[PDB]
Amino acid sequence: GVRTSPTGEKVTHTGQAYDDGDYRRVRFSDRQKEVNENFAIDLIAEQPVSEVGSRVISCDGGGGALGHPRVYINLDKETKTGTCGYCGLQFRQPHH
Amino acid sequence: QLIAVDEKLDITTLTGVPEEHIKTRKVRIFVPARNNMQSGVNNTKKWKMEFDTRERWENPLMG
Amino acid sequence: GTSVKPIFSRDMNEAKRRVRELYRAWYREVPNTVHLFQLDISVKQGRDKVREMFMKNAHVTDPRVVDLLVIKGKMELEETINVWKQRTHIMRFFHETEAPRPTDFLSKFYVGHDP
Amino acid sequence: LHHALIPHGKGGRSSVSGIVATVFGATGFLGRYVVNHLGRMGSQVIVPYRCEPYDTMHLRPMGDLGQIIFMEWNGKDKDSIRKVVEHSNVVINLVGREWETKNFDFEDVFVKIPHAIAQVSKEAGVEKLIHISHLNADIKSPSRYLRSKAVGEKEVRAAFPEATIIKPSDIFGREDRFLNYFASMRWFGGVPLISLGKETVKQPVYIVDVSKGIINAIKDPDAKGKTFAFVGPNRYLLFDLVQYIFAVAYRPFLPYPLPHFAYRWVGRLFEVSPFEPWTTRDKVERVHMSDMTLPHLPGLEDLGIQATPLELKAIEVLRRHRTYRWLTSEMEDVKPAKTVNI
Amino acid sequence: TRPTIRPRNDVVHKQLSAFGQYVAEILPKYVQQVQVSCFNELEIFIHPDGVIPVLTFLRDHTNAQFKSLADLTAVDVPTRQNRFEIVYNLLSLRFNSRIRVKTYTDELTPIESSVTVYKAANWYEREIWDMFGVFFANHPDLRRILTDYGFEGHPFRKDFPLSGYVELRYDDEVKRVVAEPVELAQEFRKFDLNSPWEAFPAYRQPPE
Amino acid sequence: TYKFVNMREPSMDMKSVTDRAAQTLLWTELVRGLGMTLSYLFREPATINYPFEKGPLSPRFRGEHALRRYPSGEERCIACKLCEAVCPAQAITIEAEPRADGSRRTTRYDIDMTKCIYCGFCQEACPVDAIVEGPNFEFSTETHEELLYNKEKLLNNGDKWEAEIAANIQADYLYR
Amino acid sequence: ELVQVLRRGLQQVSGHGGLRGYLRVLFRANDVRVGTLVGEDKYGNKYYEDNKQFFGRHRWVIYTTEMNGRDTFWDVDGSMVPPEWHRWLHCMTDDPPTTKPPTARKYIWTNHKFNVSGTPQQYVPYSTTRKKIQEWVPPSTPYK
Amino acid sequence: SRGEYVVAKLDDLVNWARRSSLWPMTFGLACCAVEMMHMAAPRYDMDRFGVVFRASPRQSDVMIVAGTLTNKMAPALRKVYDQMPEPRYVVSMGSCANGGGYYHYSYSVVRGCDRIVPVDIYVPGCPPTAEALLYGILQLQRKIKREKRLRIWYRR
Ligand SMILES: CCCCCCCCCCCCCCCCC[C@@H](O)O[C@H](CO[C@H](O)CCCCCCCCCCCCCCC)COP(=O)(O)OCC[N+](C)(C)C
Ligand SMILES: NC(=O)C1=CN([C@@H]2O[C@H](COP(=O)(O)OP(=O)(O)OC[C@H]3O[C@@H](n4cnc5c(N)ncnc54)[C@H](OP(=O)(O)O)[C@@H]3O)[C@@H](O)[C@H]2O)C=CC1
Ligand code: SF4
Ligand code: SF4
Ligand code: SF4
Ligand SMILES: [Zn+2]
């Protein structure tokens, strides 16, 4: 989700872009500014919320021992989904 | 035999420390306070000596 | 007796004679150093530098510290004579590349925080 | 002051000085010293170059990581000048040739290029401009070099009213063409001097003094629209100066007088070299021209610089010109020269 | 207790204790303490005046015969009045044993050179002088060995900073390498790793 | 148990003395050396045709660093700073903060590759397999500054080398 | 036996596509061996194999003459190999990406890039964190 | 034109001659000299590219700084670099020569050989493999191929 600064400089996922008056933009003259094009926040926002039939769900990020440490998520609040503290995936109980 | 030197001990001229970092420095002799986040007290036994904090600035490259 | 043993000298007088002996050797060596290392300084300049290096430690009153200083000066003299040192090491005594740090209050205040 | 430009540190290699300088002509004799002094403080130096990048290797150890940036530019292209001075708050102009190449004459390197640099710096928001002219620069001199220098000086002043103009005189140093030039003519058997060098007076200045003066002018608020004359502490007759030069190099001195027309002729003959000429007619004119005395102008003493006399620095340049027999001779052995001091 | 714990050797412990008592009995004038570690290492602490007698006895006595000097070094403990601790590690080829001899000194008191007893000590003592500033009396040639020429201060001492006081670079103005006060682009980051819970109760000190 | 290497004395037989004399006068041992070197002349050389052929490597090989992602495209790194605490050369610098969605993610992640000793302790310490040493080793630069990686460069390295890093991890994670 | 190695050399000349192809490979790769084509690349590289060679020569790549934007007829480098063929070519596996393709991820680069050092596409480091201290902004209106 | 074509051809010939004949100084300091030796070994055969070690600096084209530079050695390295006849090139090998590496915060180590001599190629690693140094050498060859000395002289 790269947006362009009013100076014409690409803005990174962190959000740092030089101000028009910053002399440090000269390092990109005759060269380029390195910006990763895939934003993790937007990529994780696209994932669907998983509905499960239990009050507590488990997440290891997938892949078994190739993911993250296994954690257990509580799904008792009906106004908000449960999010993994490592992976970012969202879970909820069937409502409505 | 022994020569009976009755002077104050001073090894300043032998340590090779620049005279800036001997006269303008101020050390603090203290027992460190317990980290209030934990109840362990093993880090409050000995005495520490540290120097006065000087200037730290941001690198123009990489910050 | 303070239970302290000497290195070489037992009072300030022998320490002073060793200092004087060392000083003569350094003073004598200076012209050979200027010729051998091909330094762009005068013999007067090098002898003034030797004088300044000796006077930096003129406030010492401990014969043991004076003995150790003379020992270090002997090692320095030996390195120069045998050409172990390089024009680099000899000219480090003069600090040509260093901007002189100001000493008055106002300049220190203007530049930064160091006292 | 744009926080990113606030000075920080102890003025060393890793410090921040707040100076962002675009040094034109940084690949020359004076440019290397200026860039070294700027990078000592921890300044951001922009080095515009047109030569081969191999000829800029010596400037890379002069700054910390990221503090020296090399960009390509064209003297006749103003977009390049805008590109290199866009983010700078100081611009230094050290561009100049001592001979006229087929692609650039004297008024291309001393008039057109300085004027374009000054105008682009003014319209790009640059705060300080340092322009280097000659001490003997006037519009009525027999030398095209000095005429172009004077025209370019006035035109730069027109394009950048608050620019600092510095007029040194016969800079001498290791990579100089002054002390080196005289030493180099030993091979030609004799030393040709117009009127035996008895009617010419020179006041050479040390290269390090000029670099320090430029650096001090960069960081002096009162030196905005002033003009400085960078001269040495002593004035010498040309005969005495060349005699001292040959004495320090321990070479036999065999001077002879040469008429102006013949020595101009041999300069013209040397001019045909497609490479750097050994000497030119303009070099002859400048060598056998007395140095102007401008006491109303500020000098190195007004920037805190105590001019270094030639006697304390001639050996470091002329020892390379000695033979093995005299290679280890010391500095105070060669009887300082006679001085025409007032 | 078998798989993961290092096994004990009581026979070597008894032998080393007996030999430590033996050395202590023979040299009462200089020996101040004898220890045997829990992993069978014999340490003998001596007064600084007894370096030559104790080392000569340990090299020449028929029962000891510690001919080879394995290592000689110093340890710096600033909280002690005698700042420096001189450690001698000797190896016996006849009896297949190793002994350690320890003494002390400070910044101004010289230690007697051990070069006559062991030829190998000449470089080791030069390094101790270079790194800690301990002067050795009667050394045939005492000078710096590891540091740069004209290096000021001793690096191994605790007070000396990790990065030193000066750094080097080449300057094109003077056409040589120059020394300047150290400036760091990125300062070394100090970590506080010690835990405030006691790990080894067997080493607990009295609380005064 | 020991053996002697040079305590053999030669026989004083008349024919043995004659053989030694013939060796001295006719240089037989030197001819033997020449024969050995001639035999090597006719062997196939061990040279490979770089850059068209490459030396063998292993999945364990430690190469240029990279920051990895989860299959969904979310970054794996959670700014625990275990890699920073374990780095023997102090080559890693990390800053973090809560992201706009509250996730615990870094804002700065630099590795000074002129400080790094390429020991791989950082990827052993990482609990989520975020930082790895990839298989790339041909990344020489022309300036010093190009070897001071930041988070953008490392994430791009991960995106570029994932197809190989994942396969190398798959072949070796059972030894870890 | 000598006539047979001569036949083998002649067959090497013939199997490279005539004399022109033989000279092309001889002046590009400095090698005239012929092996079975394991597969071709997305960018023009070809990967061959010859199991009768000793370990190290049994696999090789003939680089493409035209990478992303430059002409690589003479100027080739090892950084031109994509990661899957990079794994196959360095003998980290026995499986070419033609028989065992890598897993597809949406964030994986669809276009490999060589070492871009010395070109305008070179990486330039910078600080990725925001400004730490904010300064007070004086009011725009006069005070007296 | 005609003169620019001639100077372009002469640039091509000179650069080809210079890059095909790269003679490094027989110079090495630490760990990385072992991998440089392995590059000289039969598997990689640095000789087959025209690259042969020669002891004398006066007969050297390239300096490869392979190992840690210490404050005691820096004057010697600068001395042997200054005695190389030009054109001369410097390749930095490994972390220690690149930026100080694993002794960066030491009191006796120069934080990068580029504080002493200008560096043309920075080869990263600890130590870089023999193919890494080979890649660096071929990259230096390409950089030499890219230089234009007589084109710039002709346009002065
Ligand atoms: C008369 C005396 C003065 C001149 C003497 C000259 C002697 C003869 C000239 C020698 C000719 C050989 C040069 C051509 C060989 C180049 C080979 C070819 O590969 O070059 C390619 C590019 O073309 C060359 O750069 C052309 C260079 C030559 C240009 C024309 C030569 C002009 C000669 C003019 C001589 C006139 C001098 C007379 C003055 C009195 C790139 O190759 P490269 O890839 O890198 O090398 C292999 C690396 N691989 C494996 C990756 C492929
Ligand atoms: N040195 C002296 O004795 C005196 C010097 N000055 C002035 O000081 C300035 C520099 O002195 P110095 O450095 O000794 O002169 P140099 O010739 O030694 O340096 C010349 C500089 O100008 C650049 N340059 C020359 N022509 C052009 C051009 N046409 N287009 C772009 N860049 C060009 C060169 O770059 P490249 O190398 O790439 O051409 C080089 O960096 C000059 O203006 C000179 O007149 C004043 C009084 C006396
Ligand atoms: S490989 Fe080792 S030195 Fe390099 S970043 Fe990881 S832990 Fe630090
Ligand atoms: S890379 Fe791994 S170890 Fe390092 S901060 Fe991120 S999650 Fe923690
Ligand atoms: S970079 Fe690593 S391998 Fe090379 S010299 Fe330094 S410590 Fe040794
Ligand atoms: Zn998860």
> Residue H20: CB within 6 Å of ligand 1?
no
Atom of ligand 4 nearest to the CA of F67: 1
- The whole-angstrom separation of Cα B12 and Cα D43 is 36
SS3 H70: strand
Token digits of residue F84: 């920073």
Strands E42-46 and E97-105: parallel
Backbone dihedral angles phi then psi of residue E70, each to the nearest 5 degrees: -65, -40
Token digits of residue D229: 């004359």
Q: D14: nearest CA in chain B?
A: B59
Beta-carbon contacts of G141 under 8 Å, excluding residues fewer than 6 positions away, are: none
Q: G127: nearest CA in chain B?
A: B62
Contact by Cβ (8 Å): H99, F144: yes
Using alpha carbons, select from H16, H121, H116, H9 the residue that is nearest to residue H73: H116
Using alpha carbons, select from G75, G53, G51 the residue that is nearest to residue G63: G75
Q: Please report, in angstroms and rounded to a whole number, the separation of the first and last CA atoms in chain C.
A: 41
SS3 E60: helix
HSE-up (13 A, CA, CB side) for residue H144: 24
Say what the alpha-carbon torsion angle D139, D144, D149, D150 is, to the nearest 10 degrees.
Answer: 0
- The whole-angstrom separation of Cα D231 and Cα D111 is 23
CA quadruple D78, D81, D87, D92: dihedral positive or negative? negative
> Residue H16: CB within 6 Å of ligand 1?
yes
- The whole-angstrom separation of Cα H140 and Cα H119 is 11
- The whole-angstrom separation of Cα A88 and Cα A73 is 12
Contact by Cβ (8 Å): A90, A83: yes
- The whole-angstrom separation of Cα F56 and Cα F118 is 19
- The whole-angstrom separation of Cα E185 and Cα B58 is 9
User: Using CA positions, which residue lies closest to atom 12 of ligand 2?
Assistant: D29
Contact by Cβ (8 Å): D204, D169: yes
SS3 F14: helix
Q: Do E191 and F85 touch (CB under 8 A)?
A: yes
Atom of ligand 5 nearest to the CA of H30: 5
Backbone dihedral angles phi then psi of residue E181, each to the nearest 5 degrees: -60, 135
Output the CA angle H101-H102-H103, nearest 5 degrees. 95
Q: Do B62 and G129 touch (CB under 8 A)?
A: no
Q: How many CB atoms lie within 10 A of CB F27?
A: 12
Determination technique used? cryo-EM
Backbone dihedral angles phi then psi of residue D87, each to the nearest 5 degrees: -100, 10
Measured in angstroms, the resolution is 2.8
Beta-carbon contacts of D51 under 8 Å, excluding residues fewer than 6 positions away, are: D27, H152
DSSP string computed for H22-36: B-BBS---STHHHHH
Chains with ≥3 CB–CB distances under 8 Å to H: D, E, F, G
Contact by Cβ (8 Å): B5, C64: yes
Contact by Cβ (8 Å): D156, D115: yes
Q: Is D106 annotated as a binding-site member?
A: no
Contact by Cβ (8 Å): C87, C37: yes
- The whole-angstrom separation of Cα C29 and Cα D84 is 53
Question: How many residues in chain E?
Answer: 208
Residue type for position C25? A
Say what the alpha-carbon torsion angle E144, E149, E154, E155 is, to the nearest 10 degrees.
Answer: -110
Q: Which of H64, H126, H134, H146 to mutate to test the interface with F (most CBs of F within 10 A)?
A: H126
- The whole-angstrom separation of Cα D38 and Cα D19 is 8
Q: Do A27 and G126 touch (CB under 8 A)?
A: yes
Strands A71-74 and G46-49: unpaired
Token digits of residue G60: 């090789």
Contact by Cβ (8 Å): E109, C2: no
Token digits of residue E50: 């007894």
Greatest Cα pair distance, chain E, in angstroms, is: 70
Say what the alpha-carbon torsion angle F153, F159, F161, F165 is, to the nearest 10 degrees.
Answer: 110
| Pick from F85, F90, F93: CB nearest E188 | F90
- The whole-angstrom separation of Cα G24 and Cα C24 is 78
Token digits of residue C5: 């043993």
- The whole-angstrom separation of Cα G20 and Cα F145 is 44
- The whole-angstrom separation of Cα F66 and Cα F131 is 6
DSSP alpha helix (H) spans, chain F: 14-26, 28-41, 82-86, 121-125, 151-170
Nearest ligand (C-alpha, residue H103): 5
DSSP string computed for E75-144: EE-TTSSS-EEEEEEEEETTTTEEEEEEEEE-SSSPEEP-TTT-TTHHHHHHHHHHHH---EET-SS---
Report which secondary-structure segment, H or E, holds H12. helix H3-20
Q: Do E173 and D15 touch (CB under 8 A)?
A: no
**Which DSSP letter does residue E32 get?**
E
> Residue F125: CB within 6 Å of ligand 3?
no
Using alpha carbons, select from H58, H62, H64 the residue that is nearest to residue H19: H62
- The whole-angstrom separation of Cα F118 and Cα A71 is 32
Q: Is F87 annotated as a binding-site member?
A: yes
HSE-up (13 A, CA, CB side) for residue D308: 14
Q: Is H19 annotated as a binding-site member?
A: no
**Number of DSSP helices (H) and strands (E) in chain B, helices first:** 1, 2
CA quadruple E20, E25, E29, E32: dihedral positive or negative? positive
Say what the alpha-carbon torsion angle D266, D272, D278, D282 is, to the nearest 10 degrees.
Answer: 70
- The whole-angstrom separation of Cα H58 and Cα H75 is 18
SS3 string of chain D?
Answer: CCHHHCCECCCCCCCECCCEEEEECCCCHHHHHHHHHHHHHCCEEEEEECCCHHHHHHHHHHCCCCCEEEEECCCCCHHHHHHHHCCCCEEEECCCCCCCCCCCCHHHHHHHHHHHHHHHHHHCCCCEEEEECCCCCCCCCCCHHHHHHHHHHHHHHHHCCCCEEEEECCEECCCCCCHHHHHHCCCCCCEEEEHHHCCCEECCEEHHHHHHHHHHHHCCHHHCCCEEEECCCCCEEHHHHHHHHHHHCCCCCCEEEECHHHHHHHHHHHCCCCCCCCCCHHHHHHHCCCCCCCCCCCCHHHHCCCCCCHHHCCHHHHHHHCCHHHCCCCCCCCCCCCCCCC
Contacts of B10 in chain C (CB under 8 A): 60, 62, 65
Using alpha carbons, select from F67, F164, F127 the residue that is nearest to residue A40: F67
Cα of E93 from ligand 4 centre, angstroms: 51
Chain centroid offset of residue B30 CA: 10
Q: Where are the domains of chain C?
A: 1-115
Q: Do G127 and A16 touch (CB under 8 A)?
A: yes
- The whole-angstrom separation of Cα F135 and Cα G137 is 51
Using alpha carbons, select from E90, E120, E111 the residue that is nearest to residue E19: E90
Q: How many CB atoms lie within 10 A of CB D141?
A: 18
Cα of D289 from ligand 2 centre, angstroms: 20
Q: Is F126 annotated as a binding-site member?
A: yes
Output the CA angle H130-H133-H139, nearest 5 degrees. 140
Backbone conformation region of residue G141, classed left if phi is above 0, alpha if psi is from -120 to 50, else beta: beta
Cα of H98 from ligand 4 centre, angstroms: 25
Using alpha carbons, select from D79, D12, D83 the residue that is nearest to residue D41: D12
The residue whose two tokens read 């820096």 is H74
DSSP alpha helix (H) spans, H67-129: 74-82, 94-99
Backbone dihedral angles phi then psi of residue H70, each to the nearest 5 degrees: -105, 160
Contact by Cβ (8 Å): D336, D244: yes
The second-level CATH assignment, the architecture, of A40-92 is Sandwich (2.60)
Q: Which of H38, H115, H131, H143 to mutate to test the interface with F (most CBs of F within 10 A)?
A: H131
Report which secondary-structure segment, H or E, holds H55. none
Contacts of F150 in chain B (CB under 8 A): 62
- The whole-angstrom separation of Cα D37 and Cα D212 is 7
Residues paired with D201 in a beta bridge: D237
The residue whose two tokens read 């490392």 is F154
Question: How many residues in chain B?
Answer: 63
- The whole-angstrom separation of Cα F114 and Cα F119 is 13
Using alpha carbons, select from A39, A12, D91 the residue that is nearest to residue G125: A12
Contact by Cβ (8 Å): A28, A71: no
> CATH number, domain at H37?
3.40.50.12280
**Number of DSSP helices (H) and strands (E) in chain C, helices first:** 5, 0
Burial class (CB in 10 A: 0-12, 13-18, 19+), D1: exposed
- The whole-angstrom separation of Cα F129 and Cα G43 is 31
DSSP alpha helix (H) spans, F42-150: 82-86, 121-125
- The whole-angstrom separation of Cα D102 and Cα G45 is 48
Q: Is H113 annotated as a binding-site member?
A: no
Using alpha carbons, select from E83, E82, E85, E59 the residue that is nearest to residue E72: E85
- The whole-angstrom separation of Cα F32 and Cα F38 is 10
- The whole-angstrom separation of Cα H117 and Cα H136 is 18
Chain centroid offset of residue E49 CA: 17
Say what the alpha-carbon torsion angle H100, H106, H107, H112 is, to the nearest 10 degrees.
Answer: 0
Residue type for position D48? P
C-alpha to C-alpha distances, C80 to C25, C41, C83, D52, nearest whole angstrom: 12, 16, 5, 42
Contact by Cβ (8 Å): D341, D255: no
CA quadruple A66, A71, A75, A77: dihedral positive or negative? negative
**Preceding peptide of E53 cis, ω within 30°:** no
**Number of DSSP helices (H) and strands (E) in chain H, helices first:** 6, 3
CATH of F65-175, one of 3.40.50.620, 3.30.70.3270, 3.90.930.60, 2.60.210.10: 3.30.70.3270
